[PDB]
Design a protein around this ligand. Sequence first.
Ligand SMILES: Cc1cccc2scc(Cn3c(=O)n(CCCC(=O)O)c4ccccc43)c12
Ligand SMILES: *[C@@H]1O[C@H](CO)[C@@H](O)[C@H](O)[C@H]1NC(C)=O
Ligand SMILES: *[C@@H]1O[C@H](CO)[C@@H](O)[C@H](O)[C@H]1NC(C)=O
Ligand SMILES: [Zn+2]
Length: 226
Amino acid sequence: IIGGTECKPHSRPYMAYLEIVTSNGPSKFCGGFLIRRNFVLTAAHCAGRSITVTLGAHNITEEEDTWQKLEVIKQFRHPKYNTSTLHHDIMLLKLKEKASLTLAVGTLPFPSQKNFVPPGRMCRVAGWGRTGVLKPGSDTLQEVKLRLMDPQACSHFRDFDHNLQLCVGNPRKTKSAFKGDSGGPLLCAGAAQGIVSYGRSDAKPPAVFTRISHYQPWINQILQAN
Ligand SMILES: Cc1cccc2scc(Cn3c(=O)n(CCCC(=O)O)c4ccccc43)c12
Ligand SMILES: *[C@@H]1O[C@H](CO)[C@@H](O)[C@H](O)[C@H]1NC(C)=O
Ligand SMILES: *[C@@H]1O[C@H](CO)[C@@H](O)[C@H](O)[C@H]1NC(C)=O
Ligand SMILES: [Zn+2]
């Protein structure tokens, strides 16, 4: 997160810290959010050979009792996910066991309300991502308030699609989700409307978020068949 502020410890109990393992490379890290005690929603590009989910964390460098390091039994990457266009950058992670509900760990009510369009211009996103282009991932959970933009603002991302994605972050500001924040939820009025997907390597906002409403039927199918 760039230009954000440290979250009040555990104030976002649904946040998930993912450590992704690959065959020929060091582990990578992403965000995500718990929507069912045994299901975490994140970005499809965060897929790997295996993934470990850490719930109840704030400062991920210091283990604590609130932590729940959970095994992922199966990764459900969206069938239409495309690495060249980055469309359908969404994935569901089924946890081997159902997480414990504590003050620090809880599910994000989803679905919620009923809208094909995310109301409100100001939303908020959190993550443990880099806080700058040459800055490393944050040890603590950071959050920032961002402006939902008209699709025109993301025209420069040639594969951006208003039906499938949200344009987030006033270009006049530095505030933005960044590398390491992928998979994190975009909350508007308390409801998850998007998922951090991608943007410019130079961090100039806005960034592209997966539009959740478009995937409601796919999400319900997966949750129903598992
Ligand atoms: C989430 C976000 C917000 C704003 C800007 C930017 S620029 C990249 C991202 C997220 N992001 C990422 O860091 N990788 C790994 C490449 C590492 C590498 O090539 O070094 C990605 C691969 C595919 C899609 C998005 C990716 C992002
Ligand atoms: C996180 O905890 C580590 C100790 O393991 C500490 O060095 C670091 O400053 C903490 N992060 C912040 C900025 O609170
Ligand atoms: C991804 O989409 C492009 C269209 O821009 C298409 O040419 C390519 O075959 C697709 N890749 C996959 C996932 O098959
Ligand atoms: Zn704590």
